[PDB]
Write a protein that binds this DNA or RNA. Structure first.
Ligand SMILES: [Mg+2]
Ligand SMILES: [Mg+2]
Ligand SMILES: [Mg+2]
Ligand SMILES: [Mg+2]
Ligand SMILES: [Mg+2]
Ligand SMILES: [Mg+2]
Ligand SMILES: [Mg+2]
Ligand SMILES: [Mg+2]
Ligand SMILES: [Mg+2]
Ligand SMILES: [Mg+2]
Ligand SMILES: [Mg+2]
Ligand SMILES: [Mg+2]
Ligand SMILES: [Mg+2]
Ligand SMILES: [Mg+2]
Ligand SMILES: [Mg+2]
Ligand SMILES: [Mg+2]
Ligand SMILES: [Mg+2]
Ligand SMILES: [Mg+2]
Ligand SMILES: [Mg+2]
Ligand SMILES: [Mg+2]
Ligand SMILES: [Mg+2]
Ligand SMILES: [Mg+2]
Ligand SMILES: [Mg+2]
Ligand SMILES: [Mg+2]
Ligand SMILES: [Mg+2]
Ligand SMILES: [Mg+2]
Ligand SMILES: [Mg+2]
Ligand SMILES: [Mg+2]
Ligand SMILES: [Mg+2]
Ligand SMILES: [Mg+2]
Ligand SMILES: [Mg+2]
Ligand SMILES: [Mg+2]
Ligand SMILES: [Mg+2]
Ligand SMILES: [Mg+2]
Ligand SMILES: [Mg+2]
Ligand SMILES: [Mg+2]
Ligand SMILES: [Mg+2]
Ligand SMILES: [Mg+2]
Ligand SMILES: [Mg+2]
Ligand SMILES: [Mg+2]
Ligand SMILES: [Mg+2]
Ligand SMILES: [Mg+2]
Ligand SMILES: [Mg+2]
Ligand SMILES: [Mg+2]
Ligand SMILES: [Mg+2]
Ligand SMILES: [Mg+2]
Ligand SMILES: [Mg+2]
Ligand SMILES: [Mg+2]
Ligand SMILES: [Mg+2]
Ligand SMILES: [Mg+2]
Ligand SMILES: [Mg+2]
Ligand SMILES: [Mg+2]
Ligand SMILES: [Mg+2]
Ligand SMILES: [Mg+2]
Ligand SMILES: [Mg+2]
Ligand SMILES: [Mg+2]
Ligand SMILES: [Mg+2]
Ligand SMILES: [Mg+2]
Ligand SMILES: [Mg+2]
Ligand SMILES: [Mg+2]
Ligand SMILES: [Mg+2]
Ligand SMILES: [Mg+2]
Ligand SMILES: [Mg+2]
Ligand SMILES: [Mg+2]
Ligand SMILES: [Mg+2]
Ligand SMILES: [Mg+2]
Ligand SMILES: [Mg+2]
Ligand SMILES: [Mg+2]
Ligand SMILES: [Mg+2]
Ligand SMILES: [Mg+2]
Ligand SMILES: [Mg+2]
Ligand SMILES: [Mg+2]
Ligand SMILES: [Mg+2]
Ligand SMILES: [Mg+2]
Ligand SMILES: [Mg+2]
Ligand SMILES: [Mg+2]
Ligand SMILES: [Mg+2]
Ligand SMILES: [Mg+2]
Ligand SMILES: [Mg+2]
Ligand SMILES: [Mg+2]
Ligand SMILES: [Mg+2]
Ligand SMILES: [Mg+2]
Ligand SMILES: [Mg+2]
Ligand SMILES: [Mg+2]
Ligand SMILES: [Mg+2]
Ligand SMILES: [Mg+2]
Ligand SMILES: [Mg+2]
Ligand SMILES: [Mg+2]
Ligand SMILES: [Mg+2]
Ligand SMILES: [Mg+2]
Ligand SMILES: [Mg+2]
Ligand SMILES: [Mg+2]
Ligand SMILES: [Mg+2]
Ligand SMILES: [Mg+2]
Ligand SMILES: [Mg+2]
Ligand SMILES: [Mg+2]
Ligand SMILES: [Mg+2]
Ligand SMILES: [Mg+2]
Ligand SMILES: [Mg+2]
Ligand SMILES: [Mg+2]
Ligand SMILES: [Mg+2]
Ligand SMILES: [Mg+2]
Ligand SMILES: [Mg+2]
Ligand SMILES: [Mg+2]
Ligand SMILES: [Mg+2]
Ligand SMILES: [Mg+2]
Ligand SMILES: [Mg+2]
Ligand SMILES: [Mg+2]
Ligand SMILES: [Mg+2]
Ligand SMILES: [Mg+2]
Ligand SMILES: [Mg+2]
Ligand SMILES: [Mg+2]
Ligand SMILES: [Mg+2]
Ligand SMILES: [Mg+2]
Ligand SMILES: [Mg+2]
Ligand SMILES: [Mg+2]
Ligand SMILES: [Mg+2]
Ligand SMILES: [Mg+2]
Ligand SMILES: [Mg+2]
Ligand SMILES: [Mg+2]
Ligand SMILES: [Mg+2]
Ligand SMILES: [Mg+2]
Ligand SMILES: [Mg+2]
Ligand SMILES: [Mg+2]
Ligand SMILES: [Mg+2]
Ligand SMILES: [Mg+2]
Ligand SMILES: [Mg+2]
Ligand SMILES: [Mg+2]
Ligand SMILES: [Mg+2]
Ligand SMILES: [Mg+2]
Ligand SMILES: [Mg+2]
Ligand SMILES: [Mg+2]
Ligand SMILES: [Mg+2]
Ligand SMILES: [Mg+2]
Ligand SMILES: [Mg+2]
Ligand SMILES: [Mg+2]
Ligand SMILES: [Mg+2]
Ligand SMILES: [Mg+2]
Ligand SMILES: [Mg+2]
Ligand SMILES: [Mg+2]
Ligand SMILES: [Mg+2]
Ligand SMILES: [Mg+2]
Ligand SMILES: [Mg+2]
Ligand SMILES: [Mg+2]
Ligand SMILES: [Mg+2]
Ligand SMILES: [Mg+2]
Ligand SMILES: [Mg+2]
Ligand SMILES: [Mg+2]
Ligand SMILES: [Mg+2]
Ligand SMILES: [Mg+2]
Ligand SMILES: [Mg+2]
Length: 93
RNA sequence: GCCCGGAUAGCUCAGUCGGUAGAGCAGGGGAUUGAAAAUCCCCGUGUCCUUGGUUCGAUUCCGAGUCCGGGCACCA
RNA sequence: GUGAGGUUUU
RNA sequence: GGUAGCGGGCGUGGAUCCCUGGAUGUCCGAAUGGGGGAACCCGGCCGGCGGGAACGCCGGUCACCGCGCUUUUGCGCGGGGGGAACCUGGGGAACUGAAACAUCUCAGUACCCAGAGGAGAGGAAAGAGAAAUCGACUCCCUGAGUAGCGGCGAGCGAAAGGGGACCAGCCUAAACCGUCCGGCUUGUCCGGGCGGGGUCGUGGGGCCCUCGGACACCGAAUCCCCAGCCUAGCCGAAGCUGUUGGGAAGCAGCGCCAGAGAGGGUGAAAGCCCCGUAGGCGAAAGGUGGGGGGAUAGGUGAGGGUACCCGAGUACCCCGUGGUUCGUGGAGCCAUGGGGGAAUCUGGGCGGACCACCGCCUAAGGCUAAGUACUCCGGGUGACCGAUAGCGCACCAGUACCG
RNA sequence: UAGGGAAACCGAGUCCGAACAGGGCGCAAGCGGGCCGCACGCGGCCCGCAAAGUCCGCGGCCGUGGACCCGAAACCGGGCGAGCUAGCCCUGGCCAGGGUGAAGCUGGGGUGAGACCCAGUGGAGGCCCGAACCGGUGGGGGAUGCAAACCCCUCGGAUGAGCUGGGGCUAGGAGUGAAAAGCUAACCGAGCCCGGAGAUAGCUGGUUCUCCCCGAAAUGACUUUAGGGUCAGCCUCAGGCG
RNA sequence: GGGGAUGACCCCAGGCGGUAGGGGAGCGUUCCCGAUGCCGAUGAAGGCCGACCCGCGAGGGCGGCUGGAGGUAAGGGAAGUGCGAAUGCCGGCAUGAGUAACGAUAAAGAGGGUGAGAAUCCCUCUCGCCGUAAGCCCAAGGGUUCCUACGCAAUGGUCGUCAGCGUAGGGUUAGGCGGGACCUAAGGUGAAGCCGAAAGGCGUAGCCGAAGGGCAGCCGGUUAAUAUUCCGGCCCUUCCCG
RNA sequence: GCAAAUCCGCCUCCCAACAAGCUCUGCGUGGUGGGGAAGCCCGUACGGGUGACAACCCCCCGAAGCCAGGGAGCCAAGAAAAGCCUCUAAGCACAACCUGCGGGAACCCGUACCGCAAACCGACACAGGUGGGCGGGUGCAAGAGCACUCAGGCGCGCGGGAGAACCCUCGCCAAGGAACUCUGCAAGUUGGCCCCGUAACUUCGGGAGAAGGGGUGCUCCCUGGGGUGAUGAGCCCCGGG
RNA sequence: ACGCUUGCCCGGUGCCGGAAGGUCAAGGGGAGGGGUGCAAGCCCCGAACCGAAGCCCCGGUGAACGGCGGCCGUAACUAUAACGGUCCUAAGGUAGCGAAAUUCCUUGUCGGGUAAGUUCCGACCUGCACGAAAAGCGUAACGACCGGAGCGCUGUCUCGGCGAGGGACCCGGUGAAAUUGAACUGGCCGUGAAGAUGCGGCCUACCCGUGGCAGGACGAAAAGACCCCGUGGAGCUUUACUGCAGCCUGGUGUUGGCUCUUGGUCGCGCCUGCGUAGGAUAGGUGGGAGCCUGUAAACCCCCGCCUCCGGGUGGGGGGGAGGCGCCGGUGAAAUACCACCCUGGCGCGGCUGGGGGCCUAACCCUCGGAUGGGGGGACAGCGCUUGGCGGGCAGUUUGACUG
RNA sequence: GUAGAAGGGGGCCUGACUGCGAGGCCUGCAAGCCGAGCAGGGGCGAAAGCCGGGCCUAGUGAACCGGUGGUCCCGUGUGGA
């Protein structure tokens, strides 16, 4: 799925397996022996954030783990202790 | 094709961690046992892989591989 | 407290 | 109404018909009070009716999601679904071609999903590429089947520049400043929304000093008005006689008009029998108004000092990938799935491994008309057809019929 | 209109090369030609629209496009179907009649007590015979039939591993399967409908008016190739030699 | 090759079987320039003939009959341009041929009536068949096929006056019967929540979901067609009001 | 009882205890109402008057149906929720609930016909298939089987001649009895009930209805009973001589 | 189902276990080189070494896949095998059956059944080519299964006949079907693509029908259902190829705090060499007549240090001119003065590489009413990357000449 | 085919060269083979002359992708790689 902050999507990518040592390191070269479609995913991980309303769980990538904890200090001057444990979620940017 | 361990007597094998070497068969007669089997005894078969070198030497150590194998590639 | 690779019938 | 037939009534006091604005518009259908096997059933609240408490009906409101206000209640603004073809993004084949065939081609095509449009996408250079050059973007013709890629086989295939259609450029965060709120050490600072301040490569901009003068100019893509166009239409020249025949428009005589001798109908073959073509008028009302006049928002300058800021897990490196002609080749650039990981103009990216010089441009935020594709629909044309043609249907057709 | 060379680069020359040896590429060779300018080297001229090429038309052929037409077995994408059939879940219904007589119970015999035996009672079985019912073993008819799976007789189970009504779930490289590769809407070694797709076919068939002139071949050299191909041989047309 | 009046008209010599093919010359059809024209009721295209004329031909002229309103030179062009074959297609009509069959071997016969027409329609008297149905009542399913009156255009495997066939008019009456305003199982949808590129897929509470549970009606008559509904007797249920 | 209870569950019980009381069904009787034939006249059809003041009594067989949530046995262990009964939370106790007495209201859809076929599904008025219930009587021991026949329908929607070969179905046959054929394939015999008898072998059940046989009709007399009815008179059943 | 058993061998393969050892990926590490720049710097390689899974190797596993022999001589001729010698050997089939659903020779041989038996039954074993859980031999009951025999009875037959109904036949009514080049369609003998109604010769035959047979029209149906070809298409298999699902595994993110001993380029330091032939704690060698020495020697008493148990080398606190080697002695080599690195027990400079023990907040599971308890615990799962297994799946290929 | 050496023996050398190659055999094409002669510089022989492998016919493999030396030709703005 999509990240909650950045938005990195699971992209498709070919898995081009081949056989043969290369040109400058060998004799002939690299011949492609088979191609197949492939489904690359991101590091979608869960993290708990202790806000005084509710301990919210997120879904964020490993390259954006410090974006969440950096985003707590940005999300500290906003309205704390909201009237429901769900409205704290979508009000991050 | 780099690397890995070796080629010993018709047969296969006792080996060195550098100063050693072969035992068994289709074989002839043989103390034996009161003239019976062969327990046991002489006995027919070493370029110890081809070759170069520390070395008193090479029947044994080390270097390239011609001899055969497993993994590893690479083959337009 | 100790002894047999062990035998065959003319 | 097609559309006959019986039986009735309307119209100059303007009937029928056409166009525009309205009202009603049962039920289903995004369906949306709820259920539901679509065109059915059952309700809640507020008013009314039937003698009306119990029963029924009518008129409003009651689905979900994202926003602003409302501290919760609730009120306003949008979205859901469909659309012949087109466009963008995310997935995505196989037969065929290589006279097999797995890389490749077919092809990022058919097809599936999402949203928007009368187009979409793209767009104001971290561009292009050799000339110190061009200067947003889109489309056509060239360049050119060229350079290139490719079991270097099949085959795929640019870009630069030029001639053209069109031409519009902008907005915002950052440094600095004012209010309010949040954490709280209520210190002298942090975090967020608003108001001024900035949109740059000739580097721009914040603060301070000097030159000052704008109170003059530009100007929308926003708004207002209007020319014009569309949804109904109107005016609009000119001929008779006799004969064959059932029928004259033919034929014979004398004529007429032409800004109209296109077409169709008229018992047959007509410029002068009719409807209209030439040409000119026509809007009360509703749409368009890219065309043209006005208004506003918004823009306007030079030197010195300071080096505070110029788009963060981002540039860059490695592995795995897609696109450009680039299939891993010397493999650049554009985005990145993962790992490491800064700087803010003495900072960076690019000019095809790479190093130095020399040139171009500021990425990591967003918007943008015009030129381009297509025809459900409107009309005109056709060396287009004429009921086995043409769309599947010229006819009461996506019907009868099959499943 | 200038071409060589892989390019650099050079140019009526270039390249191979030390080279003017030698060779491969092009080059100039003269068509209409009063050209007598009066030097028979004639320089080049009236001058055929040409050596010399381009643009358009009309034909033959070819490549990419479906490319003379018809016809597959198949592949992929999106969906429709478990009202037939296969399995299963929930809820109901069906099984006439007759017999054999298990476990237990009661009574009697037995001994010290049982175990054990007999009689009655008892009515369970994937029991037996046999109806509706679900099936089709064997025979006959039916064979453009009554029927795109029947009819007459005989049959196996018929209290169950049973039969069946109603509401559902499972699906195409998948479902289900007491397992045959059966069934999945009358045809299943991978359904049906649409689209790619006018797929491909060196494989069959067909290919429409007339007249005239010439006229073949079934051979050779090669191909994961022998029924098809490329070149040559054979034929025809046009332009030149004679 | 020649006379070369260049004659595109006649002499001389040679040749004229032919598939796949190569080449040359013509005919016919749709439309277009010619066409603001010409032909055409004294008769156009098309249809049926010709023993007529021209042409080696595809064919073109002319004459007669039918037809009732279009056709188009000469010279050219563009083709959706010439059919007998493709187990081609579409529509018609043949052969098979007055042939097989006429649909369970349960079975018909006779007298009257209607009617133009009767083995087939209506009535009566005999005979046969089913009678755990070939009888009756419901749920499926079908959707006016039910009844009456008038008829045989078409249908009934023959006829038919009849018809489940056509035209018209009627006919289905519910507090108590079966469903909803009651509930639930398998299963489906689905607040919260979870997962997945999107379409979407799981999923608590709750909702839907039945031939399952609960709930108050029995007997007889009436029409050509309605009956636990209409009516006669008789008994109950739910809710509201005093 | 994811408790709030006087309700339910558990433990202490003076008692009752195979019972009785109280509630829930079915049947009979029951105020009363309806039906009332076969046969006969009028009969076009349809059917109508009828024959009555109609009778409407008794006996037996007897269900898979009702009481029902009965009883016994067995393992494979045999749904949910709603109505209704009861106790309470917030609330209300001038309310609200229950039983009577009188008066009102009861809504939307189905309703015809065929429904084991001519109207459903099979291109057809198709010898196929289609769920549930009633599905009579007599005899065969019984029975939804067989044969016939009540009520109800039907003669199957092409017939009439002759009575060739040949096809299908059926019946019969001197003598042989499987000799035909790949094979007793097909056809035929045995067949139901009661009574004697029943082998090899075995997992002791079975084989087994083994194989083999005898009887079955009708009339009269005597007699054992059982059920209902009353103890038997009457009526059904099992028999024996 | 059940009675008796599952005997032989682990060589190939599958599987399990393996802290010894070989190979190997990403990666870590990096001597030594290359390009460029005036250099500072930047960019490429890079051999040593470390580095899992997997493969190789060892053992086990046969109610795992899988198989289970030949040859020469010997007993009163024959026969043997029960005995003696070989192995492509891992191993040579044991019990129990056997011309059998197995047997080619074969109808093997004998006996029963019949008069006649290629079938059947019971044995013989000469098992091409039974066989022990792809189970071996029997077995009460049972089977719409197959094979054989007998019995009473039957047309099934020798050998047919007769009768009945529904068709067939005639008449009245309705009235198709596939096939079809046109047909005015004779036989024989020859020819013709090699099987003649049509061609040639001879013979026969008036035209047209009705009922029947099916010998012909190479009759009809289906574009052979057998065989071959197509570089046709599918289903299935495998140690045929390549990928994928899935599984194992190193690195890395999620993912942390500590501790123990081990590892690598690692020589600053410790003091390690005795098969040894003589005097031996004798390393190969380099100087080898000087220095241990009065800044505290010698028979051996200090003594940490290691040890093959002999013994030597450092702190030397009390000694007091004596230790004795270059040669002789050993030999493949001569020290005692200055150390060149191997052989090693060992302190540490660079990174901790791996293996354990504890806590745990991340993460996961779980508990009635869950911002809180319990357990696992930085492991699992998940992403990227690397290597291996992998017909479970998919795309595929498997040639041609050929009397 | 060869003794009027190509056969056997001895001396000296590597022409078992580099750039070409007129004219041909054969062939569909691709290939295969003979090659007098020119230049440079050699070997043998005093010279004339011969030597561009083997007495001859078989002893092999088109193309593409790459490896090792030289050439310094191109090398993507410039100089280099
Ligand atoms: Mg990171
Ligand atoms: Mg003795
Ligand atoms: Mg009108
Ligand atoms: Mg009128
Ligand atoms: Mg009127
Ligand atoms: Mg009027
Ligand atoms: Mg008006
Ligand atoms: Mg309107
Ligand atoms: Mg309304
Ligand atoms: Mg609704
Ligand atoms: Mg809905
Ligand atoms: Mg109100
Ligand atoms: Mg009111
Ligand atoms: Mg009122
Ligand atoms: Mg809206
Ligand atoms: Mg498109
Ligand atoms: Mg895309
Ligand atoms: Mg493909
Ligand atoms: Mg291909
Ligand atoms: Mg492409
Ligand atoms: Mg939309
Ligand atoms: Mg849309
Ligand atoms: Mg536009
Ligand atoms: Mg646009
Ligand atoms: Mg846009
Ligand atoms: Mg845009
Ligand atoms: Mg910009
Ligand atoms: Mg351009
Ligand atoms: Mg321009
Ligand atoms: Mg501003
Ligand atoms: Mg007018
Ligand atoms: Mg006018
Ligand atoms: Mg007139
Ligand atoms: Mg006119
Ligand atoms: Mg006139
Ligand atoms: Mg507007
Ligand atoms: Mg405009
Ligand atoms: Mg700064
Ligand atoms: Mg690339
Ligand atoms: Mg990039
Ligand atoms: Mg990234
Ligand atoms: Mg960069
Ligand atoms: Mg660069
Ligand atoms: Mg249109
Ligand atoms: Mg049409
Ligand atoms: Mg017509
Ligand atoms: Mg339909
Ligand atoms: Mg030349
Ligand atoms: Mg020239
Ligand atoms: Mg089913
Ligand atoms: Mg159903
Ligand atoms: Mg049974
Ligand atoms: Mg029944
Ligand atoms: Mg069956
Ligand atoms: Mg059958
Ligand atoms: Mg059978
Ligand atoms: Mg039976
Ligand atoms: Mg039975
Ligand atoms: Mg069934
Ligand atoms: Mg599919
Ligand atoms: Mg599968
Ligand atoms: Mg399955
Ligand atoms: Mg089927
Ligand atoms: Mg199929
Ligand atoms: Mg096709
Ligand atoms: Mg295609
Ligand atoms: Mg071809
Ligand atoms: Mg000729
Ligand atoms: Mg040719
Ligand atoms: Mg010529
Ligand atoms: Mg003449
Ligand atoms: Mg002549
Ligand atoms: Mg000719
Ligand atoms: Mg020809
Ligand atoms: Mg036409
Ligand atoms: Mg005229
Ligand atoms: Mg006329
Ligand atoms: Mg015409
Ligand atoms: Mg006429
Ligand atoms: Mg055509
Ligand atoms: Mg035709
Ligand atoms: Mg035909
Ligand atoms: Mg006849
Ligand atoms: Mg006949
Ligand atoms: Mg006939
Ligand atoms: Mg007949
Ligand atoms: Mg009959
Ligand atoms: Mg009669
Ligand atoms: Mg009569
Ligand atoms: Mg009469
Ligand atoms: Mg009759
Ligand atoms: Mg119905
Ligand atoms: Mg119907
Ligand atoms: Mg009707
Ligand atoms: Mg009538
Ligand atoms: Mg009629
Ligand atoms: Mg009729
Ligand atoms: Mg009449
Ligand atoms: Mg009717
Ligand atoms: Mg409901
Ligand atoms: Mg209601
Ligand atoms: Mg419900
Ligand atoms: Mg409920
Ligand atoms: Mg559900
Ligand atoms: Mg769902
Ligand atoms: Mg119900
Ligand atoms: Mg019910
Ligand atoms: Mg409950
Ligand atoms: Mg009814
Ligand atoms: Mg009725
Ligand atoms: Mg029934
Ligand atoms: Mg029917
Ligand atoms: Mg019928
Ligand atoms: Mg029927
Ligand atoms: Mg049935
Ligand atoms: Mg009797
Ligand atoms: Mg009886
Ligand atoms: Mg019966
Ligand atoms: Mg009767
Ligand atoms: Mg009848
Ligand atoms: Mg009849
Ligand atoms: Mg009939
Ligand atoms: Mg007869
Ligand atoms: Mg007889
Ligand atoms: Mg007899
Ligand atoms: Mg016989
Ligand atoms: Mg015989
Ligand atoms: Mg039989
Ligand atoms: Mg009784
Ligand atoms: Mg410099
Ligand atoms: Mg340097
Ligand atoms: Mg540096
Ligand atoms: Mg059975
Ligand atoms: Mg017979
Ligand atoms: Mg019949
Ligand atoms: Mg007839
Ligand atoms: Mg013949
Ligand atoms: Mg003839
Ligand atoms: Mg003849
Ligand atoms: Mg026949
Ligand atoms: Mg722990
Ligand atoms: Mg925690
Ligand atoms: Mg813990
Ligand atoms: Mg981990
Ligand atoms: Mg496969
Ligand atoms: Mg393929
Ligand atoms: Mg000589
Ligand atoms: Mg050549
Ligand atoms: Mg030689
Ligand atoms: Mg560059
Ligand atoms: Mg450069």
């Amino acid at each position: 799925k999509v990240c909650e902050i950045s938005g990195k999507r699971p992209i498709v990518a070919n898995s081009i397996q081949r056989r043969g040592k290369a040109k400058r390191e060998g004799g002939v070269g690299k011949k492609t022996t088979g191609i197949s479609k492939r489904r690359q995913y991101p590091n979608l991980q869960k993290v708990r954030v202790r806000v005084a309303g509710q301990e919210i769980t997120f879904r964020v990538a490993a390259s954006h783990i410090p974006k969440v904890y950096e985003l707590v200090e940005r999300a500290k001057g906003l309205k704390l202790e909201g009237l429901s444990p769900k409205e704290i979620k979508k009000e991050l940017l």
